[PDB]
Design a protein around this ligand. Structure first.
Ligand SMILES: [Cl-]
Ligand SMILES: [Cl-]
Lengths: 33, 237
């Protein structure tokens, strides 16, 4: 339902957590890719 | 920065580029802000995992506008120490703030200058200006010229409808337009959100996180500096 609340992942060099509303909250660093 | 325009040299004299050096290049990965001649303010997640007392290959660049041309005001100074908030939460981004101590002092001039803090507890309001060298669309390209965007603040309660009640802490501040299209993005982390409701420019937020960038209904989320002013003053020597 996009994700389960409390899951974590990486998106390239950024870190993400699944919010209570089911979306990925991700940091905003620049990644050398 | 998504939906912005080009900055001018000296327009944002407090803006820093936070860079890591590798073979063949210096890589911008975060923004930062000048607090005083020896200290920068950035996000905690920009430094988590570093060798805090002996950081290697990290530097700031002050007086920068266009990364692809040396215009003469750039000041590159290596970072000598990182002071990460000791209650930083790497997952949920509570207390997402760090200081960078520089190995030497910045030279202040028209193009290089501190940004004032608010008073502890001040409530920022009005349109605010977010700046950085982040991507210009989600998943997009990065500009060589510093970008600026104006966005309104979104109340914590309104933002919690998007992200969840406990996901937005009071010590976070949200900014964006309901229709989307204006936001910070990847590479803007750690840089400034500047307000001016006191009649003068001050640092109201630090770029932190969001769902994507510039999406309708998903404002950017920032560390709210007025919750951490006493922390900053206690830790910047
Ligand atoms: Cl407007
Ligand atoms: Cl606006």
């Amino acid at each position: 339902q996009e994700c389960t609340p409390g899951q974590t992942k990486k998106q390239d060099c950024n870190t993400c957590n699944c919010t209570p509303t089911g979306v990925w909250a991700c940091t905003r660093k620049g990644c050398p890719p | 920065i998504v939906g912005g325009t080009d900055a001018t040299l000296g327009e944002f004299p407090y803006q820093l580029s936070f860079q890591e050096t590798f073979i063949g290049f210096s890589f911008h990965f975060c923004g930062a802000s000048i607090y005083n001649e020896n200290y920068a303010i950035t996000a905690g997640h920009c430094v988590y995992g570093d060798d805090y007392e002996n950081p290697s290959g990290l530097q700031i660049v002050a007086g920068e506008l266009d990364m692809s041309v040396n215009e003469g005001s750039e000041q590159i100074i290596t970072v000598s120490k990182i002071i990460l908030h000791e209650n930083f939460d790497y997952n949920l981004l509570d207390n997402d703030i760090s200081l960078l101590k520089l190995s030497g002092s910045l030279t202040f001039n028209d193009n290089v200058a501190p940004i004032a803090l608010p008073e502890q507890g001040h409530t920022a309001t009005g349109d605010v200006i977010v700046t950085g060298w982040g991507t210009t669309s989600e998943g997009g390209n990065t500009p060589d010229v510093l970008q600026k965007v104006t966005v309104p603040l979104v109340s914590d309660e309104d933002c919690r409808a998007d992200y969840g009640a406990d996901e937005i802490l009071d010590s976070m501040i949200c900014a964006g337009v309901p229709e989307g299209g204006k936001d910070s993005c990847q590479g803007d982390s750690g840089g400034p959100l500047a307000a001016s409701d006191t009649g003068s420019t001050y640092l109201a937020g630090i770029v932190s996180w969001g769902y994507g960038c510039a999406r309708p209904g998903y404002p950017g989320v920032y560390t709210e500096v007025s919750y951490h002013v006493d922390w900053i003053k206690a830790n910047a020597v």
